[PDB]
Subunit: 267 residues, 7 copies
């Protein structure tokens, strides 16, 4: 009735909620537009594609209006915990979606906090190998020796071995020279030691191994482990190998073809 308003004053609390609910909305909407403008303005400023910038700004818009709408529903007195539990799980959905996306971000942060490599540092990121051109924040671009550009996601980097090459200035070449069984072991060892000692780029302060490593099927395999600076490594390999090939057939030592004893049976 008309007198019902006079006795009690808690009906005030029913009324202020109403305009308060409007005050959740008419502030929430113009903000949702406003932010959706600014987020767009700071998207195009970074030169990011317009069909995507519009969509992400619209996502922000459609999220802030959702916040203010659910807040107004809770303001008047609707128990909005249901929708809340749903879009919380939607945030969880996009979070587990962006798991593999943000893992690359965290790994890119780690790769500059501490630096397993820099721009211009030859590496092998678990397979592919090349000179890093630039460690970006979501990916690591590197030029392999074949001239290809490989864009590795940083999460695949930090989740695996980072086999650097250009950190230590000195590395090792390993030759496996297969000679014949009938060759004199001491002759091979001395005519190889002369090679690796007359080569000036091989470091003598390190270990210079020339020792019999394997009794192969057809051949007998000598290992030659010689250290050289990381820039002179491949040239040392090629030069020492050409010198082996020349000094052996000068000395009469024969690199054997795949041998095969043949027992003969005429039938």
């Amino acid at each position: 009735g008309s007198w019902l308003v006079a006795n009690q004053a808690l009906l005030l609390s029913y009324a202020v909620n109403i305009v308060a609910a409007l005050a959740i909305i008419i502030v929430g909407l113009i903000i949702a537009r406003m932010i959706s403008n600014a987020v767009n303005r700071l998207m195009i400023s970074r030169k990011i594609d317009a069909t995507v910038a519009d969509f992400l700004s619209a996502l922000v818009r459609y999220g802030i209006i959702a916040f203010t709408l659910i807040a107004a529903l809770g303001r008047v007195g609707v128990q909005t915990a249901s929708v809340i539990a749903v879009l919380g799980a939607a945030g969880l959905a996009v979070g587990l979606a962006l798991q593999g996306s943000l893992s690359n971000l965290a790994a890119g942060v780690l790769l500059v906090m501490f630096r397993p490599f820099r721009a211009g540092e030859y590496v092998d990121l678990g397979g592919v190998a090349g000179t890093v051109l630039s460690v970006q924040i979501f990916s690591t671009t590197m030029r392999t020796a074949d001239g290809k550009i490989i864009v590795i996601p940083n999460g695949k980097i930090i989740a695996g071995n980072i086999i650097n090459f250009s950190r230590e200035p000195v590395r090792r070449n390993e030759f496996i020279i297969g000679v014949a069984y009938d060759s004199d072991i001491d002759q091979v060892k001395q005519i190889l030691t002369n090679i690796i000692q007359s080569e000036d780029r091989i470091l003598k302060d390190r270990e210079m191994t020339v020792r019999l490593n394997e009794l192969g099927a057809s051949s007998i395999n000598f290992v030659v482990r010689v250290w050289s600076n990381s820039g002179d490594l491949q040239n040392v390999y090629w030069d020492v190998l050409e010198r082996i090939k020349r000094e052996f057939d000068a000395a009469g030592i024969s690199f054997p073809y795949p041998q095969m004893d043949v027992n003969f049976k005429r039938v």
Copy 2:
């Protein structure tokens, strides 16, 4: 009794909730229909299949009616946190279901924020390789060299290496020429250097390697690493290889068949 209503006025709060609960429903239903219309209208406008558009609009319908029903139950005074905890986990279920679906969306956003490739850019997305036709938002369509169309999900792209080819204009061809052990190393090197120097598409400012790389089982393998523009790469390979094949059997150098020494035992 009849006098029980007179002393206390909090019974009002029991009453307004009732119509308020109706005001959760008769507004919630017509909205649930209304949105379920509009969501359908903006589904068919995008030419999306009707049996699926109807189902998704019905999902929105059956979700908004759930919100308003749980809200009315909370309005009258039912403690609806149980159902809330259930459909929150249902939202979580569809979220972890849409994890692999929305990861492709996030990756498609990243692939246009920063561009590891564009339409018409030959790439190799961890295995398969081809010219990208169009980077869509959920997938990346590319035409391989065999004429097949490969539709790669962007999450499989960003989660792996993006081996581009058409970014850097210059690449490297690597020949591995196997000649016989009895061939003169210097003759091979000079008759190969003449080939790679008389070829005008090979870039001379880069490194032109012709050096002995391996002592094979039957053969001795020379590596030839020569740089050329990324368009002239395969033609340079084919031409230099034909020229090798012709200049070697002109010069007498023999590409060896798989050799096999045979020790004979008549028994």
Copy 3:
């Protein structure tokens, strides 16, 4: 005492809760039965197995009675957040169980929103390959070339490459013809070019490669890359290959058996 009821009137609030709790139950039970009927009725209407329809309708029954029971316990004043936190995690359990089940549903939605393939479109879904018969909502049935029916879950599809064949009408055949080293390169190239030019189904506006691709161990391998319509591809392969086999041993060119030089040592 008996006078204790007269001074205070909040004891009313203790009383209405009681029948209110009954009003949580006697409405919750008949609904739980009622829905459990209708859910069953709309399960058998879809011809779904009765021992499973009964179980799922009983699950709905045993869930709605759980909601109303916990709600009545919260109504009287029990703090039911414990059981709530438990069956919320049970909903989470079935959600993470239905993760791999609903991922197929989401992927089936995506496969008709945008269509990497239609019914009758030959494809290769990361391994297995065949003509799609029907893209259902949880799975994709396709008939391989061997006549087998392969029912691929859509989550395994969207999570991998979709190598289509019947989208682009033109594809490429790649022959690798191994001839002997002593054969004339120009003779082989011209007697192959005549073959691929006199074949009318090979498209001449495309690239018609006949160029020396590899110096094999025993053979020398010419690549022949010729484009043809996707229907005439296999027949072109077979015809061009028969023609190669006939024109070569007409022209004297020999396809070599695996050669092996044998150095002889009588011991």
Copy 4:
């Protein structure tokens, strides 16, 4: 003091909570026992092992007493949200534990909602292949051709390809007949076409391919693709192959051994 009880009546609320807390316990305990009886009774009724039935009934017992204890603590006024957040995560622990267990349940539900196979339907569930004996709810038992019983969890089924065989009644046999290079191609094709046409179980309305598929290293390989009913497939393979073996060495065509040209060098 003694007068402190007279002025205020909210002390009543402190008192009723006490017996109310007892009313959380003396109802919670006898229920926890009671359910723990019934859950056991409906466990042994299904013939489930007693040392496990006792443990699961004790789990239910120790969970319901936990609910009522935490509820009594919240009743008196303890803020029990800590323990709540802990056993909620314990429910989450058992949920993520039962993830791989309930995924099989959901997949078993899907495998009878829609049926990629029935009892007695030869299939190949991503590797292993056999006749399904019975699709249970957690697993799928099938007898392979070697007589082994393979119990596949349904989550491993739905998560992979379901290569059926006994759905389509017609399938394809593919022979790869390697003959010698010196054999007449037309003779081979006609003496094979006569075989596959005089075989009555080969379906002639389908495609009957006999065409030259490969120029092998030693051999030349003809493909023979012939369709037959899925029951007569293996017998057709064996019969056509025996007939090939007999008609070829009747016709003089020779299946070649691995050929190897040998260039001889006496040294």
Copy 5:
């Protein structure tokens, strides 16, 4: 002031909380000790290592004191939701840690609810194969044929195929007899059929295949598929194979060595 206590009586509520907080602690501590005793007593009673029993009882101690401390802090009025959210995630940490531990428990429950194998039942649990000695609750111990004891975690069992052998009493032996191309097919088939028919342990009611399965490179391979009881399987294989080896070189049929045609070129 001193009069401030007289007007208001809610200060009582500040006071009872204090001793109530003590009543959270002096009950919580002696329980935490008490349970930590009993949990230890029921750990040593099961003969579980003392350095671990002490640690787990101390974990229970340090957890119950945490509950009562946080509860007292919430009792006085501290908002303890922060620490709550932290040790809830700690419970989640140990839960995701015990994921792989409790999955074995759930699988061990399943392996006795329904039994894919019993003690003494030869099986192959995805690789390793042997006679199950005892299915414990966390693991499955089985003795392989080589006498090794293999303790398989039940989660690795239920997550993979369970290839039983000792369920069905009858199994199949598959011989692949490679004979020469020049051998009479009918002679081989009849002298094999006589073998598999004169063997009394081979079941004749089943299928007794002796049919030409493959045209090998050097040999021609006959398949012999014969069924026998699962105990007599290996002995049947060995006996039938010895009989094949004897009856063939009695009948003149020759098992061929790897043949190789050699085209000779003196150069």
Copy 6:
């Protein structure tokens, strides 16, 4: 105004909160220091590295001050649920980080609750194999036969097969003796049975198999399965094998080299 304090007394509640907030802080800080001392003192007492002990004690410090600060903010009346939801997820972050760390702890608890192996028990933990030296709580140290020390994390143990060797005292040696096709089967079987019967360490109560297992390509392979105590296994293998090698070339039986029939064609 000045009279505003007189009418209402709830302003008291605004005031006590203030010093109460201080009572959240001046107790929270000195505790945070105090615990951060004791946690450090019980870290150095266990000889744990100081740069890490300081960091973990500082983590405890910076966490307890966070608790008391958020609690004071909630005390005065700030709604601190935002920060709470953030550091709850931070606790979740460290929990999912410590997932693989605490899984090893749980597995180490299981490996001493029930013992698949003890110190000095030769095992093979899914690959690597050796004698366990000590099962620690986070790892399992074992010395392989090559003298290497392998520190296996217990989660990698419990998550895989535990192939024990030193539990059962008796194991099986399996020889696969390849003899020539022209050798007498009965002679081989009897001259092998004499070997395995005259060897006293072979257990005769077990099964002593000497039966023809395979018709190899070049050889015919007899299996010899003989049981011996787990300590005498390798010595039995070596002795029986030396005896086979000696008694066969005493008896004239020849172990065949890889045979190869050569069909000759002079061209």
Copy 7:
């Protein structure tokens, strides 16, 4: 109206919230700046890159302003649980992103709590092997024998085997000497035992095996297992192997080439 303020005094509570909300902001902002300064100052002090230090300090800034803004919204009376549930899931997103980043931190803590290796301790971390240079907190740098620097993330270490070499001072060399079948077994064993006994670096207190291990295809393989100190291991291998190669062709024992019996058929 103007009299509305006089009757009720709860309007005070509406007013103090307002400036209180300002007191959430004007304290929250200057702190957010202040911390964002100090966090930057303690970032540059550690020499961390400025473009990243600025971003992380801005993240802290934009997070603390978010806390105070949401707190002010909750202060005035907005129900801010929606945004809370969103940025809680954002914290969860960065947490699951930093999962693989912080797992390395936890593993680096474990690798110094207990030490499977120290700086200068040769190891093999599941594949790659080298001398550890320094165990950092996020990674483990080690120099392999080839001179490469390998930076292993500690999570890849603790998650796999840690095959140490330099813990135990004594290790085992295993030679597999393949001699001919016609060689005297006792001669080989004694001329090998003399070698391994006249070598002073081989430990005689350990086991010195020289026993016939395998009947190879072409060869007969003797195993020689001899223990030596971990520093003298490779030199012992090389010396004993050279001595074998010399003493055998001194004694007439022949290391056999791959033998092959050839049955001859002139056709």
